[PDB]
Assembly symmetry: C2
Homo-oligomer: 65 residues x 2
C-alpha cells in the first residue's frame, strides 16, 4: 500500500508502507485551540483521543487524503 | 452525542449515546464477497480488521452517515 503521510496542510507527500498488513490513516485533533492532522501507514487503527475530532482508517492506496 | 446506528443500506436510524466518553463510528467490511456497514455509538474506535474496507470515528452529531 501507498499512503499520504503529510501533516496538516503541508505539501502532499506519500510513503510506501512496510508490508501487506499495513493500511492508511488520517487523524485530526485539536491541540488547545489549534487543529492538526496526521497521516500515514499503520497496521493498527489509532484510538480516537478525547481531543481528537476524527480518525479514519482505510485500506486502499492513497485513501487518506 | 447522537449517532447513526443503521446497518448497511437499511433505513436511517439514530441512537443517543449513554455517556460523555462516546463518539460515533462507521465500519465498512467485506463478509465473503458481500459488503456490510455497521454504525453506532462507541467509546473506542474499532480496529480495522483484514477484511475491513474502512473505519471512521467522529464526534459531531450525525457525523457517521
Amino acid at each position: 500500500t501507498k499512503c499520504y503521510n503529510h501533516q496538516s496542510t503541508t505539501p502532499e507527500t506519500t510513503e510506501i508502507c512496510p508490508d501487506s498488513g499495513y493500511f492508511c490513516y488520517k487523524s485530526s485533533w485539536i491541540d488547545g485551540r489549534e487543529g492538526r492532522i496526521e497521516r500515514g501507514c499503520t497496521f493498527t487503527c489509532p484510538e480516537l483521543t478525547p481531543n481528537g475530532k476524527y480518525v479514519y482508517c482505510c485500506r486502499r492506496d492513497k485513501c487518506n487524503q
